[PDB]
């Protein structure tokens, strides 16, 4: 079996040059559990239609259901 | 000099008098003027699709005496009424009228086969059933 290996001078230097997926295979860094890729694309397009923060628009919503 | 010119500055005469003599072939004549495109109802294609209008009882030409059991097929992309042939031993019972068909040729570039007059095309499939497999009884024709 012909492979390829890397060995560093220390452990703290190994965390900044190695990719983030090899740290998950080895247990050195925990894998973050984000949303799906097609789910982040739909959240981004819903933030494009909201200009500003969004709490200002929510004040308009509570005055719509009353009247 | 065997009729043709042999001048060193005479390549123009040898390239025009070829083009005045390429109109004597068959293959060069059918390609430029669109004879396969305008006439010969398959529009430069290998197969097509049509609808059976009626069945034929076309008698074979001399010296043979037989009935070739042809059909009348009206095409979809052109709408021309084209006779068609069933190349099996009794798949005329396997076909009906007003059916989606699939047509092909004979291997003679038009030019009706001989002993079957006026028919230049054959039938391969009728509504996607592969009549070769029905003649060997491999599958079943649908009800609709």
């Amino acid at each position: 079996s012909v492979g390829f290996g890397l060995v560093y001078n220390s452990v703290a230097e190994a965390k900044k040059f190695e990719p983030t997926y090899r740290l998950v295979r080895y247990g050195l860094a925990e894998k973050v559990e984000k949303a799906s890729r097609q789910q982040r694309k739909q959240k981004k397009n819903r933030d494009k239609k909201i200009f500003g923060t969004g709490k200002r628009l929510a004040k308009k919503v509570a005055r719509r259901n009353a009247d | 000099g065997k009729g043709k010119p042999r001048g060193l500055n005479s390549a123009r005469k040898l390239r025009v008098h070829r083009r005045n003599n390429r109109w004597a072939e068959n293959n060069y004549k059918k390609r430029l003027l669109g004879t396969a495109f305008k006439s010969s109802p398959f529009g430069g294609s290998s197969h097509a699709k049509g609808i059976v209008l009626e069945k034929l009882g076309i008698e074979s030409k001399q010296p043979n005496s037989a009935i070739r059991k042809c059909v009348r097929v009206q095409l979809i992309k052109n709408g021309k009424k084209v006779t068609a042939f069933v190349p099996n031993d009794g798949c005329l019972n396997f076909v009906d009228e007003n059916d989606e068909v699939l047509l092909a040729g004979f291997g003679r570039k038009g030019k009706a086969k001989g002993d079957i007059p006026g028919v230049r095309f054959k039938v391969v499939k009728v509504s996607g059933v592969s009549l070769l497999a029905l003649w060997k009884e491999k599958k079943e024709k649908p009800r609709s």
Binding site: - | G57, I58, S60, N88, D89, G90, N93
Partner: protein, 60 residues
């Protein structure tokens, strides 16, 4: 010739032959070993030499 013709016997000869069953024969070899069985029947043991050899004779 004519156009109007009879349509009553569209496959009658096929519908009157006696449908017989294929005989259960042993399996022929496939691919490479079929070329072994084909090589023996041509040069190992010639069946008959009646001037020239024949690959499918008749019973006589």
């Amino acid at each position: 010739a004519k156009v109007h013709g009879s349509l009553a016997r569209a496959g009658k000869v096929k519908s009157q032959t006696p449908k017989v069953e294929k005989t259960e024969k042993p399996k022929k070899p496939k691919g490479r070993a079929y070329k072994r069985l084909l090589y023996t029947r041509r040069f190992v043991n010639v069946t008959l030499v009646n001037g020239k050899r024949r690959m499918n004779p008749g019973p006589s």
